[PDB]
Amino acid sequence: MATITGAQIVARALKQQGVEHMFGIVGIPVIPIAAAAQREGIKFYGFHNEQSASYAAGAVGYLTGRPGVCLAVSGPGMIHGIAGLANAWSNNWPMILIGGANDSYQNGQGAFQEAPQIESARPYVKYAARPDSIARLPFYVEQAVRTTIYGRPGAAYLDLPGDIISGSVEEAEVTYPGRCPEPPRTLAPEENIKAALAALKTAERPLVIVGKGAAYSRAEDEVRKFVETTGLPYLASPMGKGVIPDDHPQSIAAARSFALQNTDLVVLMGARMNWMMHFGQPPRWNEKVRVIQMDISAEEIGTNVPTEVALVGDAKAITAQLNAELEKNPWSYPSETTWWTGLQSKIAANAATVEPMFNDDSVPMGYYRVLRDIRDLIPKDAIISNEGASTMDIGRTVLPNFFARTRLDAATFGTMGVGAGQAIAAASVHPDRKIICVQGDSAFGFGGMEVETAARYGLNITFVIINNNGIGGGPDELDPAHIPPGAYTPQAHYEKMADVYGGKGYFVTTPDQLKPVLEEAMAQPKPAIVNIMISNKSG
Amino acid sequence: MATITGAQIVARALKQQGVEHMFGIVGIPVIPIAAAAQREGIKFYGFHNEQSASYAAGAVGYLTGRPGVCLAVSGPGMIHGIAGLANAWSNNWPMILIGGANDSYQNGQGAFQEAPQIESARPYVKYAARPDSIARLPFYVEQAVRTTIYGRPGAAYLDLPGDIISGSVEEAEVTYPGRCPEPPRTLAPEENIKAALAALKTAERPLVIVGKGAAYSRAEDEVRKFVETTGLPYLASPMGKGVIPDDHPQSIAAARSFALQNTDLVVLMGARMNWMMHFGQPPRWNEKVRVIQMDISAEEIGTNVPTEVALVGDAKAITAQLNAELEKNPWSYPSETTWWTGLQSKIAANAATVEPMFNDDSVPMGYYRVLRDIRDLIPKDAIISNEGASTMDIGRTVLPNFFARTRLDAATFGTMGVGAGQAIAAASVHPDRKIICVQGDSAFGFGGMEVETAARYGLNITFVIINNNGIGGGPDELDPAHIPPGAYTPQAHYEKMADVYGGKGYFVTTPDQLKPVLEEAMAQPKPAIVNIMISNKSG
Amino acid sequence: MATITGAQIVARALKQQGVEHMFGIVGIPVIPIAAAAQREGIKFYGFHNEQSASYAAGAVGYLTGRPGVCLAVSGPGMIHGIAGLANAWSNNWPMILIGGANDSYQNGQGAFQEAPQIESARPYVKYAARPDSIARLPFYVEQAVRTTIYGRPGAAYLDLPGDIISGSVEEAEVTYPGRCPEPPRTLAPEENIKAALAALKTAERPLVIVGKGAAYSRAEDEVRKFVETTGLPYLASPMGKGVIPDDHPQSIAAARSFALQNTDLVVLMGARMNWMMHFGQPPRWNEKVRVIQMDISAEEIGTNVPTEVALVGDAKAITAQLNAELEKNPWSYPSETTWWTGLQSKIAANAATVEPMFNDDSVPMGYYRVLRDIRDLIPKDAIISNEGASTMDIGRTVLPNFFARTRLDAATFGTMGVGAGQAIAAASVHPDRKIICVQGDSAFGFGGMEVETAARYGLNITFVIINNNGIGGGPDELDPAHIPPGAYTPQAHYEKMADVYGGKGYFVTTPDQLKPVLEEAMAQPKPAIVNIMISNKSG
Ligand SMILES: Nc1ncnc2c1ncn2[C@@H]1O[C@H](COP(=O)(O)OP(=O)(O)O)[C@@H](O)[C@H]1O
Ligand SMILES: Nc1ncnc2c1ncn2[C@@H]1O[C@H](COP(=O)(O)OP(=O)(O)O)[C@@H](O)[C@H]1O
Ligand SMILES: Nc1ncnc2c1ncn2[C@@H]1O[C@H](COP(=O)(O)OP(=O)(O)O)[C@@H](O)[C@H]1O
Ligand SMILES: Cc1ncc(C[n+]2csc(CCOP(=O)(O)OP(=O)(O)O)c2C)c(N)n1
Ligand SMILES: Cc1ncc(C[n+]2csc(CCOP(=O)(O)OP(=O)(O)O)c2C)c(N)n1
Ligand SMILES: Cc1ncc(C[n+]2csc(CCOP(=O)(O)OP(=O)(O)O)c2C)c(N)n1
Ligand SMILES: [Cl-]
Ligand SMILES: [Cl-]
Ligand SMILES: [Cl-]
Ligand SMILES: [Cl-]
Ligand SMILES: [Mg+2]
Ligand SMILES: [Mg+2]
Ligand SMILES: [Mg+2]
């Protein structure tokens, strides 16, 4: 009778549960898993460090609604992968770390790479399991996948001893669960839907905030209809950008600080009152601000600031409830108020502030001058990976998104080291699209070796480094006796790393080079690296 | 009156406790800690990834007997550094990870990089503390330091909320403990000393195993005297190499398998019966092997295999006891026995096997041909960082050490990613010496960016890459449809990364290039990278 | 061929490793373990609550130097037993908690009493393991036992899934390790021994502190010799009482506060500078006290106060080193010093203060009057379980111990709930001796049901209750509208609980009852309960 190994069972089960992308580094005892994954049609990418690979797995979860898988060897391989668990935990992204473990009959002997891996994953996962036996592996795979995507999404860890992977059972002894179905999109009570709309009608300065929860829910159509029907001003969080196109006339992103400080009623659509929103507290918010909060996690309701109307459930379903109730009882915010006037004035004052910076041609160059030529060459449906400090914060302001889930950045954990991994994930999920990775020089160095990974798999990524010689800048000449802790080699020629795989690297210092270099670099058949020097005083 | 910040208190206490080397990446909230560490005379190295920096910290502990410090930001910074905690835990090396945390008065709010950092470090540390107040910081620093180096050495984690770092107290409020003394060197009972020597006199095929615990104990003088007085055959573990010079006539390294399989009594001097020694069990050991075990950890005694004589205490002190008892009652193993004859015959047969490989000039080249020329140009007091699979395992055989603590490799955890970090740690500890980094191509990619860190600090490191196109080898041409999980870009020109910082990169394919290229590379004032292609069949 | 279950294997291995006492409560799946333990000759005691049972296991470890075993069912049974693990952790006593677990093939299903038991035990154990297979069970038992008694003693947890317990293997597949030997008694370097005695000679006001680590080391004969040879004053910690007989002329126990405040050099013999010693800090100690510290734990050296001479190793062996060096170089503290004269003055005042209270016959009675008659009737070799607040702290003062390891109290963790369990442990280890349990009324209530356990097994235990109607005293009359949080029913007749098992209960309120009742109760063939009312203003 026919037999099958644990590795093959895991690969077949993962494929059945909708897993399509796997990132990691092979080695004892997970070599057969990557091989069986390739034969099952799962796309496997061999990275240079599991850290970057584990970040890629979480980004796949955000982009597709099914967990990406990070495959790691026992011990230090799994521990490197904890970075991606924690990032997925922080952003509530579906993600599975699969870590090898030493053979179970060697526990307690000081086996090769013996480590407490379950306990190391526990703080950051919704689910951690070591399968008891080979025949029950599909049980744990299905339960892990379902746990990552049902409820508030998050991370799972599977601990596979080497003898579970390499052992075999009779195929007739293995039961496979059906593919985990899409999670149920739960709805708010009818009274909360009505109380939320009634509350909006009493507000003098209302504001909608569209966060990456709305983007993960795939709610862009419902959100856009809700914002347009109500005529409400809206603000997109960094990764909420593009749920509504960033050029929409009701966006007040250029008046963000004014809007947050003066709004009296905010509608949080899949966004938390966490550090990114200044906890919804003074001085950045008004002391008496009223909150309508839409979130799949009931425990998030009322964090930091009380919530007047709680809308617990799926953002797509709940926003459809609001649009349906607005169909029965139409209402819109007026086009001319003192609120719109003040918002429109601040937007105009901001345009006056940034225009001299956008057209500043002095050398060394500023952020705005460089991001202007980058922005004007990105395809409209390209996916942008944007990572750094000022590179990423100004990048958020200058680089628009016109579709949902097309910006990947440092997100809630503020992580450096996600840039190349998230770009590789985006390229894997969207093979037909252009991927633009825009990183600060420090951010680039966290996962720089993965440019070769992008070349090896033929990924349509272009790497742009905005280089000010360090973390928020570094001197033009290093004094060997006093190297600042956050400085790097002045004018480090990172673009030379393209020569590792036969790609093209460009070194840019003057504004006249920007457009012809960025154009020729984006048309390259291999990933190009564009290294753009900027002033260490720019900001 | 005069005041002082938490960051300055921590830097001063660390310096008082004998900390000399700090590796990490700055950012909120640890920016002032690196600044104050430099003002106290602590050498701070800004890395490209905290993963590599945390590995450097553990290597410093091994090399110096005082913990190296890894400095990481809150959240993902600290989580990246968990790699170093686990490596230090695996090797019992003294090491401190200092992790920033969010301001304490923002706990529970979703603060920037809020994370359960103590619980993340817990599985791998002997000590984890969040200092309760600024004034007590020196209490925690001394307790952390003392705990890493007393008893079985291990890792510590210090959790520093931003307001503990940035807040101030009056200088007269702070008490600084004295410098933590050297740990007391404990002795074995005198009857155990006599029983051990008595047991040795009954053995027909005795063997000494010199492990890195003897190296860490700084026991080289007593261990060499003990082996020479007794005339016993000895086997050095990978990082035990050099405790006795590797050209010593009593080394049976080239007959290792024969020695372990047939010995009837082994003396473990700071070495574990773990996976490296195949658990001391059949078939690689004899079923009835008798064990004299010398370890500072009483709990380690009798793991896997029963121990006949337990010598619990410090290796230097216990070996001095053995030498003093041999001085009162002399004894030595006879220089002509059938045991010696078999060992000598196996060593000679091994020399006949490897001589053709050492002199094989065929292209693409093999490991032995390449390592032969590396070996002959390495200074005798150089420090070797050797990392990979066959690159490291063959490197252990071919590259000799003549002094203790001059080899750093993947060690007990089998970690890829330590190579450059441990090389940088070695250069920091021994600035007067040449550091040779010999890695496989895959190993090099785990932290290849750190070659720029080596250049930025002017470290005397030469990076040698032994490149077979992947993990255990990769094909000469990649099939875009079928990319092997462990392959990299064929003939990837990693030496081009030397151009990032203005160094010299060399690409070697034939034996005639080896000697002049390695000679010119080692004499470079900046770190050179030598990329050496070998066959993917070799190993 | 002959087969054997996992339960029978575990019972056989525990017996081979020196385990002689098992306490717990049976149920799925540990029922076969208790039965097999009885057939092996292990004494099994069925308690009424795993909490009390787990406290008995730790006490067995302290008394015998081999771990007592607590046997608990899966889930809440094991969780109840964590109390004992934490107490053993706090006191560094060897103990094993053996917890059942649900069948491994039901993991993830919501099985009966499925719970994360290893992670629940982790913070308090030196060792936690789920055996991977039935045939390797003896490996884990020996490793667990060895880990509890080697090094600094502590607790271990064995997680046993029901299918490991109930399954069977062929006896020829099971290898049993040899009995774990007594750990080696490690020595301090000879220069530290000389340094300690040399520092002793420079002291103006030297003091010896004898802790329960010296008692656990079985070092009483060496400690008594050292103290008598040097003529030094000594203080016995609560459970260090009896190491030297409490009526020894050199005891300064009655001048404890004066001695700690004025000593300029203390010899700590198995005793910590923890909360019990007020951290060795002012105002209770002198700011400049010098410390000679003798402890098996290197990490304990130098906690809170610097240590001038560290003596790391076994108390018995190291004290014998001190006595041997005092034989080569005799020294003794002079008579007629102001130190001894000041101490004897303080001792005489204390004796004069308490003698009125010893003879005060007023009703309600006081602590000293009651404990005077208890003291005058306890056999010299009896074992005293003394628990509560004032009942225990004054009991420490009034009830002397003449042999080592004859006082069990709340110890380092200050735990209520240990009294009856530790009395049952003591009766199990020393069946030939009288056990006296002297508890406060609140302390008695924690484990009161276990008086039936003592009667069921014919244990020679007398239960004395000192009753002041609550935690540190409650009112004479309870108003139902305002019941104090720490008060109990006034004059609660706990002695009526002897009638549950057909024993004798006594209720005592006047001094003329004390002697007749106590004499009658101690001669009972079943455990008697003496409920002694005392004033709530006493103490
Ligand atoms: N399907 C869904 N429907 C509604 N809310 C969701 C859904 N999935 C996740 N969320 C919530 O969206 C929120 C996203 O918040 P956050 O990550 O802070 O967004 P941003 O960073 O864009 O402000 C999380 O609190 C999460 O619980
Ligand atoms: N000062 C010391 N004296 C004696 N033994 C020590 C000392 N420090 C550490 N050790 C022990 O040395 C052992 C080294 O074992 P291991 O790392 O397996 O060596 P190797 O890998 O070289 O065989 C550890 O068990 C550790 O407890
Ligand atoms: N065999 C031994 N020899 C010496 N010290 C020991 C031994 N076993 C345990 N100890 C130590 O004895 C100390 C007991 O301290 P503690 O419990 O505070 O005593 P006490 O409460 O009586 O003051 C612990 O620090 C422990 O490490
Ligand atoms: C894992 C991790 N380590 C460190 C940090 C701290 N940090 C925040 S931004 C940054 C780099 C900023 O420099 P760069 O990417 O060059 O951007 P710039 O601001 O100079 O444009 C670092 C190290 C972090 N957020 N995450
Ligand atoms: C953190 C970590 N990830 C993965 C592995 C698995 N592993 C062991 S050796 C190795 C690299 C082997 O390739 P290379 O360095 O080129 O050496 P070669 O054997 O080809 O000479 C890898 C990835 C590991 N040990 N540690
Ligand atoms: C597990 C636990 N719960 C609670 C306490 C708090 N506590 C300390 S002493 C004590 C009892 C005091 O009353 P009693 O035993 O009657 O003694 P008395 O002082 O009245 O003589 C209690 C509950 C504790 N130490 N441990
Ligand atoms: Cl979260
Ligand atoms: Cl040197
Ligand atoms: Cl403790
Ligand atoms: Cl005391
Ligand atoms: Mg920068
Ligand atoms: Mg290779
Ligand atoms: Mg009471």
Q: DSSP assignment of A460-528, as one string?
A: -EEEEEEESSBTT---SS--TT---TTB--TT--GGGGGGGTT--EEEE-SHHHHHHHHHHHHT-SS--
| Amino acid letter, residue C457 | Y
CA distances, B445 to each of A53, B418, B420, B531, C486 (Å): 13, 11, 10, 12, 65
Is the peptide bond between C153 and the residue preceding it cis, with omega within 30 degrees of 0? no
Cα separation values, C498 from C154, C450, C456, C495, C504, Å: 35, 11, 12, 6, 6
Does the beta carbon of B271 sit less than 6 angstroms from any atom of ligand 2?
A: yes
- State if residue B527 touches ligand 2 by the CB under 6 angstroms criterion: no
* Among A498, A370, A511, residue whose Cα is nearest residue A440: A370
Determine whether the interchain pair C298/B192 forms a contact, defined as Cβ–Cβ distance below 8 Å. Answer: no
Instruction: Say whether B489 sits in a helix, a strand or coil.
Output: coil
Residue A108 has its nearest CB partner, among C107, C108, C143, at C143
Resolution (A): 2.2
Q: Is the CB of C210 under 6 A from ligand 3?
A: no
The DSSP H or E segment spanning C216 is helix C212-216
- Give the up-direction half-sphere exposure of residue B194: CA atoms within 13 A in the CB hemisphere: 5
For C397, residues 6+ apart whose C-beta sits below 8 A from its C-beta are C253, C254, C354
Strands (E), A350-391: 383-387
* Residues forming beta bridges with residue C508, ordered by sequence position: C532
Q: What distance in Å separates the CA atoms of residue C167 and residue A266, rounded to the nearest whole number?
A: 62
**Both structure tokens of B112:** 């920037």
Nearest residue by C-alpha to atom 5 in ligand 6: C416
Q: Which ligand is nearest to the CA of B217?
A: 2
- Cβ of A106 within 8 Å of Cβ of B275? The answer is yes
Rounded to the nearest angstrom, the minimum Cα separation between B195 and chain C is 13
Within 10 angstroms of residue C112's Cβ, the number of other Cβ atoms is 14
Tell me if B229 CB under 6 Å of ligand 2: no
The 10 Å Cβ neighbour count of residue B163 is: 16
Contact list, A119 vs chain C (CB under 8 Å): 119, 122
The phi, psi pair for A40, rounded to 5°, reads: -90, -5
The Cα-based distances of C390 to C387, C416, C473 in angstroms read: 9, 13, 10
- Is residue B460 within 8 Å of A452, Cβ to Cβ? no
Q: Which residues contact C195 (CB under 8 A, 6 or more apart)?
A: C309
Nearest to B486 by CA among A462, A28, A58: A28
Ramachandran quadrant class, B300 (left: phi over 0; alpha: psi -120 to 50; beta: rest) = alpha
Question: C296 CB less than 6 Å from ligand 3?
Answer: yes
Sign, CA torsion B217/B218/B224/B225 = negative
Please report the number of interchain residue pairs, chain A to chain C, with beta-carbon separation below 8 angstroms: 26
The dihedral region occupied by C87, where left means phi > 0, alpha psi between -120 and 50, and beta the remainder, is alpha
- Inter-residue contact A80 to A54 (CB < 8 Å): yes
Q: Are the beta carbons of C302 and B146 closer than 8 angstroms?
A: yes
DSSP C179: P
Neighbours of C62 (CB within 10 A): 26
Residue B421 CB neighbours (<10 A): 34
- Name all chains with 3 or more CB-CB pairs below 8 Å to chain C: A, B
Judged by CB atoms closer than 8 Å, whether chains meet at C299 and B185 is answered as no
Cα–Cα distance measured from residue B241 to residue B395, given in angstroms and rounded to the nearest whole number: 12
Q: How far apart are CA C292 and CA C270, in angstroms?
A: 11
Q: Strand, helix or coil at C440? A: strand
- ∠ CA B387-B392-B394, nearest 5°, is 165
Cβ neighbours for C41, distance < 8 A, ≥ 6 positions apart: C15, C20
Whether the CB-CB separation of C500 and C456 falls below 8 Å is answered with no
- What b/e sequence results for C249-286 when a residue is b if at least 16 CB atoms lie within 10 Å of its CB, and e otherwise? ebbbbbbbebbbebbebbbbbbbbbeeebbebeeeebb
Which residue type, as a one-letter code, is found at position B445? G
Structure tokens at A487: 């400085």
Closest Cα to atom 3 of ligand 4: B77
Q: Quote the tokens at residue C107.
A: 């993991």
Beta-strand relationship, A290-295 and A265-269: parallel
> How far is Cα C483 from Cα A208, in angstroms, rounded to an integer?
54
Q: Vertex B405, ends B400 and B406: CA angle to 5°?
A: 40
Calculate the dihedral angle through the C-alpha atoms of C373, C376, C381, C382, rounding to the nearest 10 degrees: -10
Q: Could you give the CA distance from residue A367 to residue A377 in angstroms, rounded to a whole number?
A: 16
Residue C67 phi, psi (nearest 5)? -65, 135
Query: Would you call C129 helix, strand, or coil by DSSP?
Result: strand
- Cβ-contact A53, A45 below 8 angstroms: yes
d(CA B233, CA B342): 12
Torsion on CA atoms B246, B252, B257, B259, rounded to nearest 10? -140
Which residues touch C517 (CB under 8 Å, ≥6 apart)?
C506, C508, C530
Q: From the CA of A154, which ligand is nearest? A: 7
CB B426 within 8 A of CB B62: no
Contact B279, B273 (CB under 8 A): yes
Rounded CA separation B17/B66 (Å)? 9
Q: How many CB atoms lie within 10 A of CB C301?
A: 24
Amino acid found at C334: P
Q: By three-state DSSP, how is residue B530 classified?
A: strand
Compute how many other C-beta atoms are within 10 angstroms of the C-beta atom of residue C539: 18
Which one of C147, C178, C184 has the shortest CB-CB distance to B188?
C184
Q: Which of C146, C188, C302 is opposite residue B186, by nearest beta carbon?
A: C188
Residue A404 phi/psi, 5° resolution?
A: -70, 150
Which ligand does the CA of C300 lie closest to?
Answer: 3
Does C110 touch chain A if contact means CB atoms closer than 8 Å? no
Q: Are A285 and A261 in contact (CB under 8 A)?
A: yes
Answer whether C46's CB lies under 8 Å from C75's CB.
no
